mmCIF file of C-alpha atoms in Angstrom:
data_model
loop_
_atom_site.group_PDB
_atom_site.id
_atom_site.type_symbol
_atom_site.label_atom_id
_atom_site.label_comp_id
_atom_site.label_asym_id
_atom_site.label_seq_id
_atom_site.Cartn_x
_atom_site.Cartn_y
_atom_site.Cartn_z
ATOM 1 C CA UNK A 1 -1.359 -6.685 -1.267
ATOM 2 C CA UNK A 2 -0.122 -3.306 -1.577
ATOM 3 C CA UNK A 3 -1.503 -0.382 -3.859
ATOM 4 C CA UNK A 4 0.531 2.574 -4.501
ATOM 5 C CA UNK A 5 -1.498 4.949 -5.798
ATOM 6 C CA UNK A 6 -0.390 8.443 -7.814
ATOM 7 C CA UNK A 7 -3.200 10.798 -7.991
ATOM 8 C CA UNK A 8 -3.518 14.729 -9.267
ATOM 9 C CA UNK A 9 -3.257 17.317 -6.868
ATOM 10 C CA UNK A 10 -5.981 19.209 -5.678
ATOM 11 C CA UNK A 11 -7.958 15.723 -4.520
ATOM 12 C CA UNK A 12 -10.007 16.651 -1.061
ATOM 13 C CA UNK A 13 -9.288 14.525 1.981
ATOM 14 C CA UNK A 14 -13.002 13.054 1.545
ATOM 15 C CA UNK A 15 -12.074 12.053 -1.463
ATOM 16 C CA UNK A 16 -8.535 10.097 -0.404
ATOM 17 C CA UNK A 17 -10.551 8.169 1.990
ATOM 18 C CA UNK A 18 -13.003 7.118 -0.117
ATOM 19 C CA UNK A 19 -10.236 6.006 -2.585
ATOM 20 C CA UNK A 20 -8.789 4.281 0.247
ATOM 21 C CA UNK A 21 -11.849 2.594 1.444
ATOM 22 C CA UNK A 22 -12.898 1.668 -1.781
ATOM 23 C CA UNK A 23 -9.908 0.326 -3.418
ATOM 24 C CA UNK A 24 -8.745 -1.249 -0.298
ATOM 25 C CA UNK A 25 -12.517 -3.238 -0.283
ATOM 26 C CA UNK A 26 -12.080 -3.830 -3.964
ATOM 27 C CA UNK A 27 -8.692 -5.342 -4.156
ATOM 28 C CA UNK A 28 -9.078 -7.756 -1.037
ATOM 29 C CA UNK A 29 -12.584 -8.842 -2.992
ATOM 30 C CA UNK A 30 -10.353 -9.455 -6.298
ATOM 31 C CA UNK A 31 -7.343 -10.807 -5.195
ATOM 32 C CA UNK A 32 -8.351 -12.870 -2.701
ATOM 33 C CA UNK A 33 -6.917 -11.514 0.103
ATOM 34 C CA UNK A 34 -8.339 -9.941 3.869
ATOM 35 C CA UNK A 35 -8.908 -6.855 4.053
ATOM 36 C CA UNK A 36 -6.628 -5.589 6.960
ATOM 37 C CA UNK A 37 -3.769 -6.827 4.920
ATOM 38 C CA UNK A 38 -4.165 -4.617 2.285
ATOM 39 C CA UNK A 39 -1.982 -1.808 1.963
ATOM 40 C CA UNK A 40 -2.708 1.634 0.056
ATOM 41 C CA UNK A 41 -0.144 4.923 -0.492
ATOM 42 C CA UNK A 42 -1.118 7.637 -1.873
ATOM 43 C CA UNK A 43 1.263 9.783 -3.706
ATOM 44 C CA UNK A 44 0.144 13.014 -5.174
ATOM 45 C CA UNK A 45 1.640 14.515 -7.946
ATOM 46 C CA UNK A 46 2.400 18.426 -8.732
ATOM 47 C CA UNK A 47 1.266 18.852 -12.307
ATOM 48 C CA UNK A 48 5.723 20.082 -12.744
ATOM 49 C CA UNK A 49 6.528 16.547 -11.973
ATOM 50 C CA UNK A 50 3.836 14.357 -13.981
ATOM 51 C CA UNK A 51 5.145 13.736 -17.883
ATOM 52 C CA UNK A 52 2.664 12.143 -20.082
ATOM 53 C CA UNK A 53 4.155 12.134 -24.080
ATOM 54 C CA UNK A 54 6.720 14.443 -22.624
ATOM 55 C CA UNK A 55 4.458 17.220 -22.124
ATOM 56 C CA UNK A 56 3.836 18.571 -17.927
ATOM 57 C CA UNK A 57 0.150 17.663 -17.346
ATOM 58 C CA UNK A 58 -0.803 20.598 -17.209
ATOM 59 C CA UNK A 59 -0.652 21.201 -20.668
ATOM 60 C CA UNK A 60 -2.383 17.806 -21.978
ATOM 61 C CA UNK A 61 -5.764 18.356 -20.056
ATOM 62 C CA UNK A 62 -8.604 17.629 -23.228
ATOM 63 C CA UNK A 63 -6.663 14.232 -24.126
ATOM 64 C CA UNK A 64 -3.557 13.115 -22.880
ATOM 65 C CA UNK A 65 -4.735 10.856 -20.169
ATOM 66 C CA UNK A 66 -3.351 12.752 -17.062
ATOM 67 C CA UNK A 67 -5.173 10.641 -14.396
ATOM 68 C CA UNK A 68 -4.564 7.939 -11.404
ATOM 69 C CA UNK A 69 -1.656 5.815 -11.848
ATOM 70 C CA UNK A 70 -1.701 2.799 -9.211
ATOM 71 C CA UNK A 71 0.649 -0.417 -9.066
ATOM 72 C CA UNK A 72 -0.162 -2.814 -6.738
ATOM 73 C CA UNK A 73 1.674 -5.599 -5.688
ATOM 74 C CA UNK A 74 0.347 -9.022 -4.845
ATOM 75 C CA UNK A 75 1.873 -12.089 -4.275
ATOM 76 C CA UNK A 76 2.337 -14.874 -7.073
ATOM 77 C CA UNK A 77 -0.696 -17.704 -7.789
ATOM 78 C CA UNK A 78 -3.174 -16.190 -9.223
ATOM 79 C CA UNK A 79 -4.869 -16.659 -12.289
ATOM 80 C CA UNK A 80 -4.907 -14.669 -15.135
ATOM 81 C CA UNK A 81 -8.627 -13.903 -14.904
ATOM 82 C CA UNK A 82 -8.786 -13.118 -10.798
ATOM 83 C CA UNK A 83 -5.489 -10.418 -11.867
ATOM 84 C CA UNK A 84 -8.031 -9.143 -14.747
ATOM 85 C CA UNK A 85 -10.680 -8.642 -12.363
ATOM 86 C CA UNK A 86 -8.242 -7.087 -9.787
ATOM 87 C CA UNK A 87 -7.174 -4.668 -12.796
ATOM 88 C CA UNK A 88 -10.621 -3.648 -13.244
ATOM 89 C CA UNK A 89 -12.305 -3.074 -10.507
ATOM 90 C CA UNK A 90 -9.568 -1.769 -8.587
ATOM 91 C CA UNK A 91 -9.646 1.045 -11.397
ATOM 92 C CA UNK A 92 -13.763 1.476 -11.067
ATOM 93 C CA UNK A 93 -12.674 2.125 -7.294
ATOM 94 C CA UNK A 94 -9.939 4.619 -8.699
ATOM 95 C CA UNK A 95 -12.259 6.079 -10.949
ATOM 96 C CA UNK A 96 -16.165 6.627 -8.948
ATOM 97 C CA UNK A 97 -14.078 7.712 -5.412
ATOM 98 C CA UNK A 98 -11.839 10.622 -7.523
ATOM 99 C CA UNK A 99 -14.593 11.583 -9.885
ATOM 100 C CA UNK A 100 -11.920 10.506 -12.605
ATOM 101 C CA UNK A 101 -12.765 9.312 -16.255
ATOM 102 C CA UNK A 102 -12.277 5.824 -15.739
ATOM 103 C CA UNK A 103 -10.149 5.771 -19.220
ATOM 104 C CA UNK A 104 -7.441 7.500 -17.537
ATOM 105 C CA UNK A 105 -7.125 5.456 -14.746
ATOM 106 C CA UNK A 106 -3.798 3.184 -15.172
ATOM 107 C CA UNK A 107 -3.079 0.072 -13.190
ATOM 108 C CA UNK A 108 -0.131 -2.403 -13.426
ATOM 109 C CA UNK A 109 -0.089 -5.823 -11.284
ATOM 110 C CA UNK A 110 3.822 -6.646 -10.309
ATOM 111 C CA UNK A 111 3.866 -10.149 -8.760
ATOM 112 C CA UNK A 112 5.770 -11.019 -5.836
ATOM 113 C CA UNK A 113 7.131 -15.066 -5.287
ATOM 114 C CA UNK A 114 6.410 -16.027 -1.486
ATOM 115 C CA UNK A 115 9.904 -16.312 -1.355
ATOM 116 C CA UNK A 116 10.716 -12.512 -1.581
ATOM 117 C CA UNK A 117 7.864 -11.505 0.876
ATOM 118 C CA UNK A 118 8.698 -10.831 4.347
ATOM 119 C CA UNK A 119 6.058 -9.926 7.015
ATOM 120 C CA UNK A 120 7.441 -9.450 10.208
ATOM 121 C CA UNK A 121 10.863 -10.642 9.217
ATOM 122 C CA UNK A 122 10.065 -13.663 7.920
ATOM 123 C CA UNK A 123 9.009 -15.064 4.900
ATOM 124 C CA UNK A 124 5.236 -16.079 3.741
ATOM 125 C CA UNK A 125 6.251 -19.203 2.295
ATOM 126 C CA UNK A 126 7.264 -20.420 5.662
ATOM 127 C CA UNK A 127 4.819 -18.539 7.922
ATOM 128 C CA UNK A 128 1.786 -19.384 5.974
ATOM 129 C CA UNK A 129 2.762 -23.311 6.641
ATOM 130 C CA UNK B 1 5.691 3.144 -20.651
ATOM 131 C CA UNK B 2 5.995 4.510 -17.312
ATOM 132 C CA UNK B 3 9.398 5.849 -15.529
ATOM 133 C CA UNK B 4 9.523 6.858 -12.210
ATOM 134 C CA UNK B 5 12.747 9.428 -11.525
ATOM 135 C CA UNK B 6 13.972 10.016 -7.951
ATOM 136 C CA UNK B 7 15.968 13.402 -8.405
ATOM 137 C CA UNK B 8 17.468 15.421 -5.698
ATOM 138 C CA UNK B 9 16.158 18.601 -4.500
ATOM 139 C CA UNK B 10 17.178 21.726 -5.919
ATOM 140 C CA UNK B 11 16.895 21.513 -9.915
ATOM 141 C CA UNK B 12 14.873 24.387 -11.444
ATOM 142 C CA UNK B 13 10.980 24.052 -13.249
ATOM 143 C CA UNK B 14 12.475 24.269 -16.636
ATOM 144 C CA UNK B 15 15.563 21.601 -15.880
ATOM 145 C CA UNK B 16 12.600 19.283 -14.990
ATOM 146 C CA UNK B 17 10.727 20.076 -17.864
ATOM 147 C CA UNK B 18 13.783 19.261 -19.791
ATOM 148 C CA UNK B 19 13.959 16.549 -18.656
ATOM 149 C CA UNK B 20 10.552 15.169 -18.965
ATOM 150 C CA UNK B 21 10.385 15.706 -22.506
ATOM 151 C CA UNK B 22 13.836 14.631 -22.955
ATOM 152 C CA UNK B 23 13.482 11.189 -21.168
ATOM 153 C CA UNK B 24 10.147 10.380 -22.679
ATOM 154 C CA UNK B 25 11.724 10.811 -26.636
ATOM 155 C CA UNK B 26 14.549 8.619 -25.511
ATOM 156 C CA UNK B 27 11.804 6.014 -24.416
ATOM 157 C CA UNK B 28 9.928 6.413 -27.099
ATOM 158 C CA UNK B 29 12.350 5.584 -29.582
ATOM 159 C CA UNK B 30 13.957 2.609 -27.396
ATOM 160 C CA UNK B 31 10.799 1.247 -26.253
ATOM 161 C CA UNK B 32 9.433 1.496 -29.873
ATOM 162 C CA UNK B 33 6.278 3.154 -28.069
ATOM 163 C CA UNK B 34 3.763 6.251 -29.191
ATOM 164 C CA UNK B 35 5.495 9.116 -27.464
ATOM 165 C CA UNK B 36 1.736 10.027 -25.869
ATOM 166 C CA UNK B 37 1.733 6.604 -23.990
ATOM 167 C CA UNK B 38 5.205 6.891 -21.903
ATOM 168 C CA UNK B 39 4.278 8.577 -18.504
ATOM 169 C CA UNK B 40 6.907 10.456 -16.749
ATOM 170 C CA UNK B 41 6.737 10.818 -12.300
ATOM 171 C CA UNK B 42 9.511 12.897 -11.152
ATOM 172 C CA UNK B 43 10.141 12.002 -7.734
ATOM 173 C CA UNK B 44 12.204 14.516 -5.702
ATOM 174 C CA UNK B 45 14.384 12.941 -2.987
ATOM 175 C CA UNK B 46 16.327 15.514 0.025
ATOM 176 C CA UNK B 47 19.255 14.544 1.149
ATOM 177 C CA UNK B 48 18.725 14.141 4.153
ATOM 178 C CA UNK B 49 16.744 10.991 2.981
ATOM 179 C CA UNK B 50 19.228 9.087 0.768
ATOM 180 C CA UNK B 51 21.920 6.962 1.771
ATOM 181 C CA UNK B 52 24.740 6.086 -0.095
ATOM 182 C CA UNK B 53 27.036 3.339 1.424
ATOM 183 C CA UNK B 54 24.957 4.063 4.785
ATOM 184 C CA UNK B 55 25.397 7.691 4.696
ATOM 185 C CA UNK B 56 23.581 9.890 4.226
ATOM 186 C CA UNK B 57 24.290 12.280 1.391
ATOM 187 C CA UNK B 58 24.087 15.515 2.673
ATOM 188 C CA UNK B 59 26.733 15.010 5.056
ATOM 189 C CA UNK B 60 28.920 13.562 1.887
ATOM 190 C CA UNK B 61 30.221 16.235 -0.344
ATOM 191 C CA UNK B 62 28.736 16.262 -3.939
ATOM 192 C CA UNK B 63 30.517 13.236 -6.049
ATOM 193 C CA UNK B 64 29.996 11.192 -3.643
ATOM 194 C CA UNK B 65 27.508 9.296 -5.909
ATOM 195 C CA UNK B 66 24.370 10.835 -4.603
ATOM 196 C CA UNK B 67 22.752 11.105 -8.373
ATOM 197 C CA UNK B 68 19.036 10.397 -9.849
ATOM 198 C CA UNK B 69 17.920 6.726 -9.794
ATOM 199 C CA UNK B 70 14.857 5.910 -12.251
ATOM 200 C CA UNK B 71 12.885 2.971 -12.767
ATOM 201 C CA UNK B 72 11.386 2.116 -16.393
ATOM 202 C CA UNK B 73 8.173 -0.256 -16.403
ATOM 203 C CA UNK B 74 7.750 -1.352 -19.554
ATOM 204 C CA UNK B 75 5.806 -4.308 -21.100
ATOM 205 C CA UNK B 76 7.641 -7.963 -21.928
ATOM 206 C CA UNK B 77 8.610 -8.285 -25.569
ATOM 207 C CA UNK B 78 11.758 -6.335 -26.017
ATOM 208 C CA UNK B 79 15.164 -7.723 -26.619
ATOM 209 C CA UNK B 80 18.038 -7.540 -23.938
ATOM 210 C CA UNK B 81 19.600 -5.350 -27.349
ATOM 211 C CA UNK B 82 16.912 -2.862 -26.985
ATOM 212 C CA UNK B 83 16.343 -2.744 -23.312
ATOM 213 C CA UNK B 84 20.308 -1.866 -23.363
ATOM 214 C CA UNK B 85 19.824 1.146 -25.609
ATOM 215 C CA UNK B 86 16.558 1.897 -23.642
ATOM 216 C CA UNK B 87 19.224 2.001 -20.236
ATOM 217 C CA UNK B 88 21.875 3.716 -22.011
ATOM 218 C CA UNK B 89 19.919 6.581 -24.218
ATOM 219 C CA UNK B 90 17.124 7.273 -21.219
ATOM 220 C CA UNK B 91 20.332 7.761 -18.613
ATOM 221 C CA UNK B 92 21.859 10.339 -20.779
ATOM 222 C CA UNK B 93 18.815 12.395 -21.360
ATOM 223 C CA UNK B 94 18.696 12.156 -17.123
ATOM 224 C CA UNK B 95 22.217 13.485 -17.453
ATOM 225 C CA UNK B 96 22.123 16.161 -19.827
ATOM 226 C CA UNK B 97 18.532 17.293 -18.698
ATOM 227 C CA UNK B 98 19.539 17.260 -14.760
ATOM 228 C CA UNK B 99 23.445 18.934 -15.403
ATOM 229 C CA UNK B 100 24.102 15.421 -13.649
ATOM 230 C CA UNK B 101 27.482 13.345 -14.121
ATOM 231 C CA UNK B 102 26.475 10.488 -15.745
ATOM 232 C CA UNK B 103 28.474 8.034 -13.265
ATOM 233 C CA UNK B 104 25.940 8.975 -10.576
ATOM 234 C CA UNK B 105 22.825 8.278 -12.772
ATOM 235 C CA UNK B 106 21.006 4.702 -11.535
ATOM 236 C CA UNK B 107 18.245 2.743 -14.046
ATOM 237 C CA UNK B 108 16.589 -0.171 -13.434
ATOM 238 C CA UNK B 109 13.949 -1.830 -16.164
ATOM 239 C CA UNK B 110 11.264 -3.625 -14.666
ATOM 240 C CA UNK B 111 9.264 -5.423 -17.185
ATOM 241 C CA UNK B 112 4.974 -5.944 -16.885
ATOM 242 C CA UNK B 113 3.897 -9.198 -18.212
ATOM 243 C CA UNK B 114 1.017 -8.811 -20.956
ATOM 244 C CA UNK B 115 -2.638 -9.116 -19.036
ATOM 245 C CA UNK B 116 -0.825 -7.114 -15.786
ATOM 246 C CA UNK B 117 -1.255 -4.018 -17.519
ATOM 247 C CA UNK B 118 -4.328 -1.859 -17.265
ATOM 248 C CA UNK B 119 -6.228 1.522 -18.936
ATOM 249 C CA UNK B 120 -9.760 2.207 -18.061
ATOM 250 C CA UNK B 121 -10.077 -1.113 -16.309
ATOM 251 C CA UNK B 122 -9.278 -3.589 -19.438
ATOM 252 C CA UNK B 123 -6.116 -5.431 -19.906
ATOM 253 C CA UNK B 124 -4.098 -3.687 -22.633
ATOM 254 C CA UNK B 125 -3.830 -6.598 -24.382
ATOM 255 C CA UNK B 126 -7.139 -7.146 -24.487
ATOM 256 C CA UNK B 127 -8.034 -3.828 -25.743
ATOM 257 C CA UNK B 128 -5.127 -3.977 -28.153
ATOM 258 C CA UNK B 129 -7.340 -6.986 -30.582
ATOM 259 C CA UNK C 1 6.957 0.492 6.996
ATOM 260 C CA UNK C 2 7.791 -0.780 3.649
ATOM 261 C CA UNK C 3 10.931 -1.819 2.140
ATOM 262 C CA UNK C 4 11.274 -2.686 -1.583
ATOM 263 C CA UNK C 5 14.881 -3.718 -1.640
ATOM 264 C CA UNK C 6 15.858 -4.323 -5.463
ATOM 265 C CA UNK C 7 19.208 -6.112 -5.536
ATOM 266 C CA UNK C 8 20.941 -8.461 -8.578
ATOM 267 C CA UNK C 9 20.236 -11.994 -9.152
ATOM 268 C CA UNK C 10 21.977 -14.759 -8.047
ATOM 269 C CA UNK C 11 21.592 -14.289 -4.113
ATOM 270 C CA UNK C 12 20.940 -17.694 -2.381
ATOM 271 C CA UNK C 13 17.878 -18.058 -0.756
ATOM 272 C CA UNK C 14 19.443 -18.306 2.756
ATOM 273 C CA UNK C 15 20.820 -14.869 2.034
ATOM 274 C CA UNK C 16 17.082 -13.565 1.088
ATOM 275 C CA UNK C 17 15.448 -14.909 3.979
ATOM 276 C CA UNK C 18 18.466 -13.227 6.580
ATOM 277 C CA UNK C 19 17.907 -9.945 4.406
ATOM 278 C CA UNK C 20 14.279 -9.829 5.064
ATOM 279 C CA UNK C 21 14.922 -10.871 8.694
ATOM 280 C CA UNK C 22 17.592 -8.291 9.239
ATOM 281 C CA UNK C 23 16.635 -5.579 7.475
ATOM 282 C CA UNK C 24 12.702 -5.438 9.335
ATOM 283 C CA UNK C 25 14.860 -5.740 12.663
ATOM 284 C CA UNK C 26 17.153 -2.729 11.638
ATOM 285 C CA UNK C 27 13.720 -1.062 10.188
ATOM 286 C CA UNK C 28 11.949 -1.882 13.107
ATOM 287 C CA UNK C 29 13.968 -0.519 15.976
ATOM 288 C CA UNK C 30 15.333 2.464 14.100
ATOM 289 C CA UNK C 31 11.532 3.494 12.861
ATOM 290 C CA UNK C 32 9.901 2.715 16.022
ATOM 291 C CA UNK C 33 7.301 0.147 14.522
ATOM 292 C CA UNK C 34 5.833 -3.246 15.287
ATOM 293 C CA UNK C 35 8.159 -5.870 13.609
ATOM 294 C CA UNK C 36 4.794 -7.494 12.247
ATOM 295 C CA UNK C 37 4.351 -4.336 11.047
ATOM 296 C CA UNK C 38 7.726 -3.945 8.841
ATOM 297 C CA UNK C 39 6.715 -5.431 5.064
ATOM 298 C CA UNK C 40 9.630 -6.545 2.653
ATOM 299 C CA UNK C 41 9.658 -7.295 -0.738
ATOM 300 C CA UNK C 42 12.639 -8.562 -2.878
ATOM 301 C CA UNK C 43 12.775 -7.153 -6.301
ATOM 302 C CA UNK C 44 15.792 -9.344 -8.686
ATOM 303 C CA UNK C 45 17.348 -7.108 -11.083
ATOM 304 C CA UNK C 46 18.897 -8.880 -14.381
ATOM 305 C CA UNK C 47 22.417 -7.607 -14.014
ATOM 306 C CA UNK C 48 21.358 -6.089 -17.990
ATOM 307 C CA UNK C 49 17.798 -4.568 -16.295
ATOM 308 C CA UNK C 50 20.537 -2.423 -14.260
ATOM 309 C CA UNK C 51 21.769 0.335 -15.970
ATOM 310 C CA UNK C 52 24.911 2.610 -13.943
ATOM 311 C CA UNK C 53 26.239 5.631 -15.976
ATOM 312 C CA UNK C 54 23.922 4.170 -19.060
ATOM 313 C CA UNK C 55 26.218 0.915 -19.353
ATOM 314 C CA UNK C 56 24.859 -1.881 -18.007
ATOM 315 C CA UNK C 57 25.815 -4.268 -14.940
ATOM 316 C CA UNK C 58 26.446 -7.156 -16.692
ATOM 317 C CA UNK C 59 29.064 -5.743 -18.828
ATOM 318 C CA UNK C 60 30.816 -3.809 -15.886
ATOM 319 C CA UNK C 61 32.866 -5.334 -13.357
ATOM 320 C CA UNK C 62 32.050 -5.975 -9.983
ATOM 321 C CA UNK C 63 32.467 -2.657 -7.614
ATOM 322 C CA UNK C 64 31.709 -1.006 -10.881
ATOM 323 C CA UNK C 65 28.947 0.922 -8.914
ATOM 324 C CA UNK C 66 26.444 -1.954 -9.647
ATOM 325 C CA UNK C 67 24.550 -2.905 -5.746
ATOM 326 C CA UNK C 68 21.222 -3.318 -3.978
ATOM 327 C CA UNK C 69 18.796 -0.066 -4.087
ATOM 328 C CA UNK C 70 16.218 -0.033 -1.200
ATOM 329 C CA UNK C 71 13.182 2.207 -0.741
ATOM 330 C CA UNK C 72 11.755 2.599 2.479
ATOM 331 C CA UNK C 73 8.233 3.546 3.249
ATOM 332 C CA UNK C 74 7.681 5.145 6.418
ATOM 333 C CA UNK C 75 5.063 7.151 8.151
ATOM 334 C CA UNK C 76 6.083 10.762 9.005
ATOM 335 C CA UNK C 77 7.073 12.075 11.680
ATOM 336 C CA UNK C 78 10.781 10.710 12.679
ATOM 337 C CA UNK C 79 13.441 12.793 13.310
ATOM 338 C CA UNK C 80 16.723 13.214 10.701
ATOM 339 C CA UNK C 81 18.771 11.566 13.694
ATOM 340 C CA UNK C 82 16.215 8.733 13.737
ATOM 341 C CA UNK C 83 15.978 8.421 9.613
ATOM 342 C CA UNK C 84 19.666 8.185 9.654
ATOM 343 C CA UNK C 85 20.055 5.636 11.739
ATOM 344 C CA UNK C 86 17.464 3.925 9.794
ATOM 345 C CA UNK C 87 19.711 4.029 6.582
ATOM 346 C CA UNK C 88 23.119 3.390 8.423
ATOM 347 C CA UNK C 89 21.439 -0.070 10.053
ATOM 348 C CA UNK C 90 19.128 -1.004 7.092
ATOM 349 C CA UNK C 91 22.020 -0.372 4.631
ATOM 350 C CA UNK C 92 24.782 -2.477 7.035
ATOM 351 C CA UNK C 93 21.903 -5.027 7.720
ATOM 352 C CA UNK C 94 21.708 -4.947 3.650
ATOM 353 C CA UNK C 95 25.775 -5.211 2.895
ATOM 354 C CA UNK C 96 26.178 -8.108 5.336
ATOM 355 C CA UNK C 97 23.137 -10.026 4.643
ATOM 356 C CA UNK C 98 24.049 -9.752 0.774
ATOM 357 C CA UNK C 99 27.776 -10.156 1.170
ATOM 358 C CA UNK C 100 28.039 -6.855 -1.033
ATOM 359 C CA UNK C 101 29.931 -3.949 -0.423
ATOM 360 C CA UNK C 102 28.614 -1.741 2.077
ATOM 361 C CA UNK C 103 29.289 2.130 -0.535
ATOM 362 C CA UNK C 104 27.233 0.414 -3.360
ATOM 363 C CA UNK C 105 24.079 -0.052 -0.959
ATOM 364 C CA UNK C 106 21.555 2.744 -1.407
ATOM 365 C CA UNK C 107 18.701 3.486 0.612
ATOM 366 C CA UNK C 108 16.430 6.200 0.594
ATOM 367 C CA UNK C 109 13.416 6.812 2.425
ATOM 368 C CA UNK C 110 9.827 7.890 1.209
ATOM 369 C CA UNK C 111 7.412 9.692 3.980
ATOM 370 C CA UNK C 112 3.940 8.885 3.700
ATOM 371 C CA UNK C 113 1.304 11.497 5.652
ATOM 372 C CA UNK C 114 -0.818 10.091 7.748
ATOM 373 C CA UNK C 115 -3.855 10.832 5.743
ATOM 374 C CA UNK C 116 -1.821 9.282 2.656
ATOM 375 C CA UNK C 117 -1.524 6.014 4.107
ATOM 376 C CA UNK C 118 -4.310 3.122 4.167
ATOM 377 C CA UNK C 119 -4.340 -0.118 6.512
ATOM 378 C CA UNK C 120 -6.765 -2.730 5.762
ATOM 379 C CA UNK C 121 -8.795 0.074 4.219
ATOM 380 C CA UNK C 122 -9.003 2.542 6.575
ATOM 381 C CA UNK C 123 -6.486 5.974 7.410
ATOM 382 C CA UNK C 124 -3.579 4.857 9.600
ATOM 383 C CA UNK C 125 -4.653 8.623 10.712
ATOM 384 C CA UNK C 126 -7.447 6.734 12.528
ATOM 385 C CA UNK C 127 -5.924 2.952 13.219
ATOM 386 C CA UNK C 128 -2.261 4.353 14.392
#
């Protein structure tokens, strides 16, 4: 699976690898998957280029929200419940390794059919066989 | 909602806040969404890292389609009617808010499926009952 | 390196599985990376999920503008000579593969610093 993550600026390098460690140990746990083949970006954000209700962050800090904003992509087959668990404590991860309220953490799942994922040039549906 | 806008270098603080709060009204209204849920990421892209037709676009004078390309998540349940007005109003708020010929101006919708989408860990649409 | 390659529907699956194998080629000689390394995934965009000047690609004609958008995820650290190449052979292994017309392929590419980017849970800073 792979998690690309946006996260506010300002974020210490301790802090990144933590998220990284964490979230990397918390999605392979939840969807199923080793570790060494998740993938995690990080993408920080400059508080000019992050919109929430139309507004730059930095002007909705008491309630808009303004926090970590991961998808992550995973392949197709699981079950509604294992994607609810990957939804959740992928965003505890978020959350305890940024010090960030855990209600502004936002995650979406987009699936992927083994059929349009290629590792190494070649596609899972026929490697995995 | 959540759109993530690739722009080209060079456009000013307030053409960006423009266009923030111009994009997020437009999908608001389209989306029929609370204006303090749609998330804007502006993405800024140089040209020396887009390719159009396999070159790149700083060594293609301006018009030759090098222009902002967004993608819209936005959760299953709308109509191919309103996902059309959501394409059509969202690129001309790109346009008018970027001073960016609307020919050049790229959006793709990319729909969540309920119980893929995530705040503070829960499922939206299991916080939504 | 990542490549999310979002092209229209309707692509046989023969012409999927020579995109994925010639696009990581192209991305894996022009980046300098491990071919196991180079990660695709095929996004299908509903020809009215595609949106070019605000009308959409199902009501346009073909060549109306309407083609396969690719983002590339590398690490940083190539050189503009290098990236171009990269988009010159990713976007001709892209026309050819799809049978679509090489000017409405567009690629552009997304650095990731080293300390941004996570293998298997640990900084690619570190694994390299």
């Amino acid at each position: 699976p792979i998690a690309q993550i946006h996260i506010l600026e300002g974020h210490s390098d301790e802090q990144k690898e933590t998220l990284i460690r964490d979230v990397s140990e918390a999605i392979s746990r939840s969807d199923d998957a080793t570790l060494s083949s998740v993938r995690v970006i990080i993408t920080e954000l400059a508080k000019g280029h992050f919109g929430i209700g139309g507004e730059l962050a930095s002007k909705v800090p008491r309630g808009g929200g303004a926090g970590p904003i991961a998808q992550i992509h995973i392949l197709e087959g699981r079950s509604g419940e294992q994607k609810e668990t990957l939804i959740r404590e992928a965003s505890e991860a978020i959350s305890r390794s940024l010090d960030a309220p855990l209600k502004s953490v936002r995650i979406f799942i987009t699936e992927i059919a083994k059929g349009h994922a290629g590792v190494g040039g070649e596609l899972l549906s026929k490697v995995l066989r």
